[model samples]
Every structure is written in structure tokens, then in C-alpha cells.
Target chain A: SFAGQLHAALDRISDRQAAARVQAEKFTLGEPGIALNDVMADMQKASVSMQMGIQVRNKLVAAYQEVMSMQ
Target chain B: GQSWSLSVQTLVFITSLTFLPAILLMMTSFTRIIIVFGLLRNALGTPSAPPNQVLLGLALFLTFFIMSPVIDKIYVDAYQPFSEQKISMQEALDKGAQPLRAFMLRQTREADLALFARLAEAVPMRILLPAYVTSELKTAFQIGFTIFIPFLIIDLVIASVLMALGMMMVPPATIALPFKLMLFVLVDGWQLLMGSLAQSFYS
Candidate 1:
């Protein structure tokens, strides 16, 4: 189960990568100011980390629901 | 001369403070294996179920189990002789690294070694044979990445399913986490994963 999730995440990451590249090009090819690829990578990373945080929150909520339902 | 001898011994003692565990973890496949286990825990939706202490304890015991034979060899060939003062320091160091290095060499892949060699190109060593630490680290990273892949895939599938169901507000991970744990438990995942990890070096 975990294995499958990990594999799919990697695949989706590669899939998202292409669109990210295109979007980066739209921002600007080169300005020597800030590379769009780096910006996009950081954005992706932040979302990923937030996803992890959200997952943890979901578990905590689920746990609370289960406990409350018992009462 | 006596003070000189004492000072050298103190220096060696101080270095061993850090070197002993580094040697243990690096030489015996502990680093790669432990990091892989950590990745698995992170993947399993538990986040910190085992906690750092428990995970580390389990890893240490597993390392001991897997490296018992190799440890015994070092004890006989290196530790014993050195303790008895039968061998010089240089000879003892070689003896100690022999079995440990053999274990690392077995786990190391040619591709990973080449990557390290390239990174250290300015060091005048064009090959990984001499870049032992760099090679070990590269191989460990490769192993961790491979171990992380399957779990990542599972997360994606669940996320996609939640999105398709139009449960975006529900949060994809909200439902998927329990299902993931169930699948892992039903398959006896820990036993299977540990078995594979142990057998990895054999064939």
C-alpha cells in the first residue's frame, strides 16, 4: 500500500515537472534576477511539505472523530 | 618519550570517540538500512509511531544480528590482537577495516561509486576505490531513494482517488491514511520488508 503511494507520487512528480518547466518559461527565459525554475521548485517543495502537514492533521482529526463517536 | 606515547594514545582515544560508531554504521550497512527503515516509517502514515528512540533501537539490534559474523571476525583478527599488543596500530587499523570494508564494498554499486568519483574529481582520484566515504554516502542515498519510491506512489494513488471522488474538501490524505495502514498490516509488511532487507546482501 505504502509502496504504491510512493511510486505514484514519484510518477506524478515527473508529470508535474513538465508543466512546471513550461510555466517557468512563461515567467521569463533569463533575466539574471531570479530563475523561474528555482522559484517553481521552491513552490513545489512548499506544497509538498504542506501536503505532509495536512496529512498529519487529517490523521489527528480522524482520531478525534473516532474517539468522539465512541461517546 | 613516555609523555609522547601517552599523548598519542589520548589523541587516538579522542578520535575513536566518533570513529567507532561511524565505523560500525558505515561498515555494516546500518546507515543504508536504517535510513531505508526511517523512510518506510515516514511512508506508512505513522509519521513518528516508532519514535526516534525505538526505531534507532530496532536498527541497532538488527545491525548486530546481521553483522554478528563480521563482528566476530573483527574481534578475532583485530580487537583481540590489538588488545593483546601483538599487532602495531597500523596493522590493527587495517584489520579492523577489513571486514567492515568488505561489507560496504558488497552493498556499493558501480554507478554510485562513479558518481562520487566524479564529485571528487579535483582530489586527484579518478576512481572510487580510494574515495571510500564518498562512495558509501552515494550508495546509501541511492538505496534510500529506491526504498522511498513505492511509498510515494501509494500516496499519489490515494490523493488521486480522493480528488476523483470530488472530496477535495475532505482532504485526500484524510481517508487514505487508514487504508494504507490496513494494507500494510494485512500483508505482514514489516516481516516481508525486514526479510528482504536481510537477504539483500546475500544474493
Candidate 2:
């Protein structure tokens, strides 16, 4: 379960980063009639998502080490 | 029992080392500087001119430059003593974070930090890290939005001229690309943007 979650978390992180870039790309190219809110919100989302994923990795690694050395 | 506990702290400290890079990524100027550079490349319509590695290398150096003071404080106050056996790992770790907390606090928005405190009642990183990063994302995009404006105006101008000349099939970007480079080169965009970015963490 831990491995699964970590793999899935990594997947989501990549997607979110790409999501921010693509939205920024479209907005920059002038094809989008969308507002600034969309591009910026996605960037914020990507930034937060990465931080959260890293935090989880930190906690999970510590937890694993604790379990491994419990004996 | 005590022997096992000592080993536990050993492995735990190792885990912290592994995790610190991510902290370095967000807690420093790395995210802000990198993002601003990425946006600048996009605005100038030269996606690969600087190349990702070059951009990353420059941003990395800029981050180091911007964070030199914090690094100095960390080494002198925390790392040096820890290595010399003058302090325990516990003391070293906490002391090291002291300078970082001050660094992030200076940049973190008072209102947002308060908001997170009320909502999360959180720890040093939990509340403060997110707030600092949220502040950084906003700042990076704000700088980028302004950066985009001049480029966007150029794009619009070329498109308007092309339309007026009955060159409808020609793309505006193909034409605007040169003018965009001209404007950026003339205005010393790199100097201006990088200086502003470096100056940003202070204010």
C-alpha cells in the first residue's frame, strides 16, 4: 500500500507540473480567451502539490526507518 | 533498549538528510527564481534558446547568491558546532532551522501566516512552509504577469499590422518573435528580472 501510494503520488506530481506548464503555454500563445486566474491558480496548485508530496515523503521515510529499526 | 533507541535516532537523522533537498527546493529562492526564468523564456518566445540546463544552472547560482547569508549563518551556528561535537544532533537541527525561520518569516505574508495558524495551528514547516511557498508562487506569477504584458502587446501589435497588410495566413508569433527579442535585449530583461527577483526576498 505504501509503495502504491508513493507511485501514485509521483504520478500526480508530474501531471500537476505539466499541467501548470501547459496552461501557461496556452495563455502565453494568446489563443486562450481565459482570464489570468486560470493560469495562476494552476501554478499555485502545482507548487502546493509538490510541497505536499515532499512532506509526505519526508514523513513516510521517517516512518519506514522507525519500523525497520524497531527490533 | 537504550542501544536500540540510539540506532533509531541514527537512522532517523539519515532520513532527514534524504528529505532536506525537497525542503531546500521550496524553502529557499529556488522555486521563485526557477519559475520566473521559465516564464521569461516563454514570454520571449524562445522556448529552447537558453535550454533547460542553462536556465537551471543560472537560477541555481542566483539562489545560492541570494541565500548566502542564510548558508553562512547555518554553517557558523549549526553545522560547525555539530561537526565539532560541541552540540547534539537535536540541538544542531533545531538551531539550523532558526535562521531559516527568520528568512522565511521576513518574506511570508503576515495575513496568510495568521490564516494558516488559525486554520492549521501547525508546526514550523506545516504552516510556515506552505505560507512561504504560497507567497512565493504569487510573487513569481506577479513578476511574470508584468513580464508577459510587454510581450503580449508586441504579439498584438504584429497581429494587427499583419491583418492590416492582408497577410492573414502569416502567424503573428513568427513576426513578433524578432521584435520580442529586440525589446528584451534592449531593455536588459535578464538584468532587470534577476535583480528584481533577488531583491524580492528582502522586501
Candidate 3:
């Protein structure tokens, strides 16, 4: 779904930004920049993702606890 | 021989030792690999066609291909002779350290490492060591960003088209997702990502 967007995003980023992205690609594979806007975006995304993860984890724990109770 | 039980703290330490690889992998390229692979599958339109097993197998093979040189170096330098006890444990550790150190050095960024060094108040020994690990993490994220771009574009394009077509009620993802997947399959995305990953290391 994002293949085209990626190309466009790369376009949106300045030439210097693109180069930095490329250079960053050539080296590390971790979190990108945390500019103010990006940071806010990250916090929102992280919250949603964390909630999702926690829900799944809670369900799994419940299942495990049920199994233990049975035993 | 009587069995001697380890204390709880010792057991915790043992578990930590065993868990370190998993922790490292999760915190590094492994998560990116799994995410990209998942996204690629979604992009392919036949989400269930390949199945999790096939996707994982492909990812695993690609990981090994990308990681082999470091693993090979470790094997030759430490593992081979260590099993034979030709070197002391300390010698094996030092030998083993070089390749892992080299990997971390290659991946980490210079500025990030310098920041850490400055915070620690230690003179930078070799810039590459810290730089490499940071670089590796940066690359992984950049790759993810690249992967997300195409999907995001498809969604936006689809949304705009739908709005223009007076199909505003329909969620754009429903249309964009399938189209993106079709494009991904047409391009042989797995092969592309594999190639890209290899090129990332080489270039």
C-alpha cells in the first residue's frame, strides 16, 4: 500500500533530507528523527500501537491463567 | 553426582544470558524484517497465499544472507578453535568480540556514538565501533520508511480519487490496499527487498 507513498515521501523530503535518509539507510536501522512534529506523530502512533499490544498481551495472559487454573 | 540448584538470582542471570540474542535481535533488524515482510505480504494482495511459514522462511533466508559474513567471521575466529579448546575462554571472547564489534561499529552513527561518549566522559577509542551500530539502526528505520511510503501514497491517491469520484463514503484503504498489493506482486517485491538489503550493505 505504501510503495507509491514512499516514492512521494522521498520526493517531499528535501534533497539533503533524502541524502541523509539514504546515508542513514546505508548504516543504521533504528528510529528516525524526532523533530517536534515527528515526535508528536510518534507519540500518537506509539500510544495506539502500545494499546494494541497490551490488549493482545492481556488476552494471552488471561488464556494462560485459565490454563493454569484448569491444571 | 548430586544436583545443585542455582539460586533465583543465578537463574535470572542464566535466563538473561540465554535471552540476550533474542533481545538484541528484537531491538534491531529482526523487528524491521518481520514488519517489512508483513507489509509486503499485505501489499501482494494475496495475503494468505504464501502463509506465515513461507514469509518467515524467506525472511530467515534473507537475514542469514545479510548476516553471514559476520557469522562466518565469528565462526572462523572463535567458534572453530574454541570447540577444540585450542584457545582459552578469554581468548575466544576477544576473538569473538572483533566481528560483533565490527558489526556494531559499522551500524552506529558517529554523532550518536560521540554523544554517548561525551555523556560517558570517555575519549572515543575508535569512531567506527559506536558509529556502526547507530548506522545499522538508522538504516533499518530508513528501510521501513521507504516501505511505508508506497503504501501511504496508495492510500492517499485512492482517497483522493474516491473523493473526486463521489465515493467519499467508501474507505480508501479498501481500494488502495488491493491496488498496492497488486503492484507489489507485479514487481516481485520479495526479490526487490532482498536485492535492496544486499545493496544497502554493499553500497
Candidate 4:
């Protein structure tokens, strides 16, 4: 269940980033209805989620190392 | 052509109601304050103490306190007149956002603002809001790092002392938590944290 949850979270992060990329691309192509604000918001959401994911991974790895070093 | 039907007006009202909390979190000081609290909890090794509701409540109050002047200006310049039917909805929105924009601009780093400005190709609310939030997170992390250092040092020292004692099986955090709490309480940490956190906002 823990691994499943983590997998889903990573998937969500990638999906969010993909959505942000698509929004930016649409705006760059000068699409009529793509609001710049919406694009920026999506980009920010993606960025924050990605940062959080990396931080969590780093912490997990650190914890694993800490446990491993225990004699 | 410029008029809205009853159904359209109802839809707009519902949408705004749903969006109100998101707007509050994004456009105000709540983001930085809540984040700092979250990090502080982690650093202090008491994630379950004070609880989520307490943190949210404190953040809300602090946000309101910091944003009081902006809220007052919005009320005086926008909502008050709008309520009396003296201004259109668009005019009220534009007027209300001015104070909030000024507040965000005051807090946001110039570099972040400039980056988003270039990306959006215009200095608009869409670009400004995200830039403001990004800057807030950066600032919050900076503050969090500062708050974390002392606790980290305590952890390191305790861990090293334990290692020197050949206590291989003992967890450092379990021993460090009490010292952290004692140090925090002895320092009047809550008052110091709250006062400094409140003062960090640009007046």
C-alpha cells in the first residue's frame, strides 16, 4: 500500500508537469482561449509538486542510509 | 449582448464561492506562514503536537492580521461602493485587487517577478500571482532553514555523543526530542517565532 501510494503520487506529479507543459505550449502557439494566468498557475503547481517529490525522495534515501548504517 | 442571464449569474456565484479559499491562500500571507509552521513542526520533532487545525487556525489569524490594512483598503475602495450599486462588478474587482497586488509586489522578489513577467510577456496578475507564491516559498524555505539549523545541530551532537558511548541501537531523535523541546520552551520560542513571523511581513 505504501509503494502503491508513492507510485500514484509520482504518477500524479508527472501528469501535473505534463499538463503544465501542454498549457505553456498552447499559450506559446497563441491559442485563443488559453489564459496566461491559467498557464502560469499550472506551471507553478507542477514546479512545487516536483520540488516536494524530490525532497521526499531525498529524505527517504537519507533515512534508508541511516538505517543501513546501524550496526 | 453585455447582460447575463439568471442561470449565468448563479453559476458565477457558485464558481466564486468554490474559488474563494484558493484565492485567499494564493493572494495573501497565508502561504508562507503555514509553510513555515509545517517546517517548524518537522524541525522540532513534534509533527503531531499543535495539530493541523491549530496550525491552520494560527496561519489564518496571522494572515488576517498582516493583511488587515490591505483588506481595509479593499473594503473602503471596492466593496463598500459596490454594495451600494455605485460601481460595476468589474470595477469592484479591479479596485479590490489593487491593494492585494501592492501587498504581493511588496513581498515578491524582483527577480522572480521579472522572470514571470518575461515568461508571460506582460506584467499581469496571472504571472504575478505565481511569481509571488514562488518567491514566498523561497522565502519560507530560507526561514525554515534558519529555524532548522539549531535543531539539526542538537541532533548531530546527540547522535555523535551516542556513537561515542557505543550505543549503536539507540535512536538519536528519541533522545534529541526532549532536549529540543526543552530548548524551545526555555527560549520562549513560541512568542519569538510568532512575533518574528508577524514582523517579517512588509508594513
Candidate 5:
């Protein structure tokens, strides 16, 4: 909860990616819970979640250049 | 030298723990990390806000964040095999030193290495440590300079504002410190700062 913010964020990002995969696979297998329309919808949400998490990574990566460029 | 002698020798090993701080100080990212934090506090115009202990504590943890992957590599490929007696001390040390050496070399400036090459060099801790330490000092100052200018601009502006308003009786620094703190808080300073620091480290 404390220093774990970065730790947890990466975890959350992975969860989103995994869930997206799960949705795609279940729909392909023609499971009871699966539907074509919902599968695409779920996948979209997963992509958006992942994109947002990546931006967080980008901001940090920004400062890295300042440090790296000095040398 | 005399032949190496057992648990009695191992007792001397624990005493080697004293060198932990020595290693932590220069051999790791600790110097640059701590110096940058000190520069940050001064830039904020609030040396005592995050007190000395807290600053050191954050810097130490930040150092760990950067060094953990290297430490993990040492743990698995080096220490693990050696502790089981599957590898000799030489092998373990050779393996363990790679990750740290790689990190130091990445951070080390090639120009700085020429300091040694003038007499002649990771590419040996003997040559690497001084070069790495010198490079870190320069890098830390570079980061500190980048951090200082923005805050310095704020102070100059604040002083100008006070002068324009004819508030000569009151010091601009006194007022500027609060605004400095305010900007740092609103900017989500620590999050971006720590993130930048983590990414700045080479894997």
C-alpha cells in the first residue's frame, strides 16, 4: 500500500492484459459465458486500461532521459 | 601469505559486515541518490521539512529499488550456487560482480575512465570504483542543477513581486518557501520523481 504503489500498478497492468486474453479465448472456445459482442467490448476495456498504465510508465521514463543524458 | 584456515574464519566474515556501509556508500547508487535528495531539499527551500533522517531513509530505499534486480541476479546465479558449495568463492564472486559491474559501467562516463587510461580499466573494481564514483558525482550535480534552476526562478520571481508590491519589510524567501512547497505537492513530486529515478537506472 505504501511503497507498493509502483509494485501494485504493474500487477494491475498485468491483470488487465491477462483478462483481455481470457475474454478472447473463452469467446473463441464458444463457452456458455462468451458472446462475440461482449468479447470485443471486454477487450477494448482491457486495452484502454493497459494504455493508461503505460502512460504512467512514460512519465517516469521522461525523467530518465534527464539522468541518462547527463553522461 | 599464510594458508587460508573454518567457523573461526566465518566469524571474521561477519566482521566484514562493517564494509556494508562502505560498499553501500560509493560502490552503489547511494552517493548520487542521496546527493540528489539533498539538492532537492535545498531547492524546495525547506531543508527541515523532510528531515535529514527521512531524506536518508528515502534515498536508501530508492537505492534498493534501483539495485534490487542486480541483487536478485547475484542471489540466484552467484550466491545460491556457492552457498550450496556447487561453485567456488571465485566463481560466485565473478558471477555476482557482473551485474554490479554492468550497472557501474553504464553509469560511468567514458571520459571519466580516461583518467585511468592516461596512466595506462569492470572493462576490475580497482579501476572501476574510482571512475564510477567520479561519474556519479558529476551526474548527481547535473541532476541537482536541473532541479535547482526551476526553483531558483520561482525565488527570483517572488522577490520581484515583493519588490513591486513594496513589501520590503518582509523577506521574499519566507513567502517563496510556501509557494515552493505548494508547487511540489501539486505537481505530484514524489511519484514522478521516484518513477524518473527508477527508470533512469539501467537494468
Candidate 6:
């Protein structure tokens, strides 16, 4: 259950980051139908989510290390 | 179409009511402040201590406090005349957003402004609002990193000490949190942080 949840969340994170990159690329390439605000907001959402994801990964690693080193 | 006019006005009012908070947050300093609050909470290693409601309420109050003068100016220059039928709705909106735009412009970095301007092919306020928010987020993160450093050092020291003592079963955050709280209290962190946050905006 825990791993499934982590997988789902990680999936969403990748989706968000991918969408953000697409939006950013659209704007950068001067594509039509792309709003500047949308791109900016999506990019920020991606960044914050990525930061949070990295922190969670770090925590899990730290916890794993802690368990591994336990007597 | 006479009755349609009244219904249309009601629809407009309801629509704006729905968007009021979102618009207010975007137009003011709430985004940066709230993000910084969240980052500070994370940095302290106490994920749920202050609670979301408390942080949001504090950020809301601080937004009002920091944006009070601009709000007052908008009321005096725009809403007052519009309410008294001395100006049109369009005029009132343009007048009201002037002070807010000025405030945001003051806070936005030149580089972000230029990037948004070039990307959007225009420098309109609509484009500027997003650029302003992006810049605000950058500034908030820069501040958040500064906040994280001291706490990070504590975490590192605690973890190292635990590892050296062969107490690897102990959680570093559990051990470090108390020391973090003590350091925060001794430094009068809240007052210092709040004061600096308030003063960070242009007067």
C-alpha cells in the first residue's frame, strides 16, 4: 500500500513536470494558444513539486540507511 | 433586454466574487509569504506544528498589513468614485489596478520582467502579473534557502553524532527538532523573520 501510494505520487510528479516543460517550451517557441500566465504557473508548480519530491526521496534514503545500519 | 441587464449584472458580481480571493492573492504578496511560511515549516523539521490554517491566516493578515497603503489608495482613487457613479466600471478598474501594478512592478526583478516581456511579445499588466509572481517565488526560495541552512547544519551535526555513537536506530529529525526549536526561540526567530518579511516590500 505504501509503495503503491509512492508510485502514484511519483507518477503525478513526473506528469506535472512533463506538462510544465511542455507549457514552458510552447511559450518559448512562441506557439499559439499558450498563455504566459499558464506557463509561469505550471513551471512554478513543477519546480515546487520537484523540490518536495527530492526531499521525500532524501528522507526515504536516510531512513533506509538508518535501518540498514541498525544493530 | 432591460431585465437581462439586471441579471447580467448579478452574474458579473457572482463571477467576481468567486474569483476575488484568487485575484487578491495574485495581485498582492500572499504567494511569496505563504510559500516562505511553508518552507520555514519544512526547514524546522516539524511538518504539522503550525498547521495549514494558522499559516494561511498569518499570511493573509500579513498580506493585508503589507498591502494596506496600496489598498487604501485604490479605495480612495478608484472604488470611491466608482461607487458614487462619478466614474465608469472600466475606469474604476483601471484606476484600482494602477497602485497594485506599481507595487508589483517595484518588486519584480528586471531580468524576469524582460524575459516575460520578450516571451509574451508585450509588456502588459496581464503578462506582468505572472512575471511578478515568478519573481516573487524566486525571492521566496532565496529566503527559504537562507532559513534552511542553519537547520540543515543542525541536522547534519545530529546525524553525524548519532552515527559516531552507533545510535543509528535514532531518527535524526526526532533528535534535531528540539535543538532547532531551542535555537529558533533563543534567536527570537519569529519576530526577526516577521519583521524582515514585512520590511522586505517597498513602502
For every model in order, the fraction of real contacts preserved is: 0.00, 0.00, 0.00, 0.00, 0.00, 0.00
Ranking by lDDT: 4, 6, 2, 5, 1, 3
DockQ for model 3 equals: 0.01
For model 5, what is the error of residue B184's alpha carbon versus the real structure, in angstroms, after optimal superposition?
Answer: 0.9
lDDT of 3 by residue, B1-203 (tens): 11111222243335346446544465433555676666655544446767888877776677677777778898888888867757754346557757666665555564677666565523343544344455555666677777878877777777887888886577665567668768877999767778886776545
Docking class of 1: incorrect
Better of 2 and 3 by TM-score: 2
Candidate 3, residues A1-71, lDDT tens digits: the string is 44365334323332333344445454455555434455445445544544554465457556755665563
Q: Write one digit per residue (lDDT tens) for candidate 6, span B116-182.
A: 7678723576578788888888898998898889989888888898899987677777677889999
Q: Pick out the ten consecutive residues of candidate 4 chain B with the lowest summed lDDT.
A: B1-10
The residue pairs that clash in candidate 2, if any, are: none
Residue range A1-71, candidate 1, lDDT tens digits: 35366335434444454445455665686646565557668567645754664475457556755765673
Q: Model 6 chain B — which ten-residue stretch has the worst lDDT? A: B1-10
TM-score attained by model 4: 0.66
Q: Chain B in candidate 1 has what TM-score?
A: 0.71
Poorly placed runs, candidate 3 (over 4 Å): A1-71, B1-17, B27-29, B35-57, B121-137
lDDT of each: 0.62, 0.73, 0.58, 0.75, 0.71, 0.74
Task: Assess every candidate by TM-score.
Answer: 0.56, 0.67, 0.55, 0.66, 0.67, 0.66
Residue A35's lDDT in candidate 3: 41
Point out where model 4 deviates above 4 Å.
A1-71, B1-11, B162-169
Docking class of 4: incorrect
Tell me the tens digit of each residue's lDDT in model 2 across B1-203: 01112333464466567656666775665887777778878777778788898888887788788888888999899988877777766457768978878878877676788787888822467678788888878878988898789888888878888888887777676677888888888998779777877776654
Residue B100, model 6: Cα distance from true site in angstroms: 0.9
Give model 3's docking category.
incorrect
